[PDB]
Symmetry: D2
Subunit: 150 residues, 4 copies
């Protein structure tokens, strides 16, 4: 399923993003002078299951979770440098049941253990001066599709 997720907006998923699901986010551009860019996977009740806060200025990517009216929990962070590949940077998220796998253009995958046991009903995209395009292309799969030889 293809979705066009606009900045400071979100997309309501046709089906719940759950175990086996794969979300491939791709941007048509890379704005070098962009600021903090955020992607959230939200449950039907608007809980933030997965929070991805890309911070060029602070040189880190922060992962966290939070209930709608709750506080953020401990942060899991990695360095921002050498993760995205211009001019079409991407972000791939896979639900492995007990944890999410997050892959950028470079480096090894990032694994984030699930904190809120609910499936995602929507994906949000927030930024004042986005690092990526608006919208970003989002292809969501119910399971990993057949792979090309290369």
């Amino acid at each position: 399923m293809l979705y066009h997720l606009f900045v400071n907006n979100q997309v309501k998923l046709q089906n719940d993003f759950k175990p086996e699901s794969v979300a491939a986010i791709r941007s048509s551009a890379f704005n070098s002078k962009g600021g903090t860019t955020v992607f959230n996977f939200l449950s039907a009740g608007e809980n933030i299951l997965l929070h991805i806060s890309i911070r060029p200025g602070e040189n880190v990517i922060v992962f966290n979770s939070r209930l709608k009216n709750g506080a953020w929990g401990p942060e899991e962070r990695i360095p921002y440098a050498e993760k995205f590949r211009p001019p079409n940077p991407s972000i791939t998220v896979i639900d492995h049941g007990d944890r999410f796998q997050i892959r950028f253009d470079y480096g090894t995958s990032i694994y984030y253990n699930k904190r809120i046991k609910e499936n995602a009903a929507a994906i949000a995209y927030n930024a004042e001066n986005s690092l990526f395009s608006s919208p970003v292309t989002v292809d969501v799969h119910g399971l990993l599709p057949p792979l090309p030889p290369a």
Copy 2:
């Protein structure tokens, strides 16, 4: 290369769309009550190498070519019905040197012999009440990529 082509706008290709090139156009939606939707492959001098006029009302898809300040030539047309597959309809265009191959979601390919011997420098998208989303996702290849087993 990924591009986001907005309605009544166009995208300047990073490289010329020429023999072997493949353009995969995908829409995040299908507007059943949409009107005539148009896609043009333009040369650097703005000649319309390939004109694709999808007409739901007239129930036909018309293919043609025209120089910037010239007149349209003879039309090559096929029935509109049962070509697109909602909710993510697509259009694939391949440059085979002496002709273009155009493929929709259903039916056999359409072959259109080249009339203006120039390479395409941009792709335009025009519609008053588009049948597709805005923008549409466009992945352009310099050659056919490796194919998945399915």
Copy 3:
């Protein structure tokens, strides 16, 4: 990297199967009346890092590990029924660092925590009356490749 793995034989990998690596095994046939079929991921020292024993007669698929001249460890099982799709069944294995993910044609993935900390140097295929063809096609990737829309 493409390999042709023959029954009761193995293939030596050009590169070590390590974190991020993906192996897509595909069969050109499905012999419904075949017997127990095994696939092993071996280390350079010939330790069996991942043993996949497909037993149609016992209606089960067994996962385990063992040192070259050591004993099998505790078994991890899953039903055999409705996992493979004829006439071209497949098995996909992905190294996630701390565990392997194994996916068949249907159902959820199976996750197997690593027990021997070494990378795989070869993949073996054993059977007297295999459920699959000989050889089976094996495409091995250093990392997940770009994914098609479907």
Copy 4:
């Protein structure tokens, strides 16, 4: 549909190779010192619809056709040099109705107008000292599949 085509043998297709069909042939090896290697697309009546003679020693690849007990027609040639990419060279053939498109690893496609109007029922592979592995992996599609971003 996946097939394993062994040298000096052939595979009978489950479906007729016809317009829109695509056959991706891939080798698990490249024997630079091999000799002339041939691939034929045959009709049910065993007419050779498309003959591809790869001759490294003559530095040429020859295309032709001929009836089961008939004579070769006029040859269509292209240089052999820099067409294949080791260690996993490939050959892709697409049926465009009025002609076949043949693509190797490098260079532009070769187009061959159909001379015998029948669909292919089998694909043959012949060689005394093949440039490729035995068997070669062959994935046959009824139509072009969705394409990955790259």
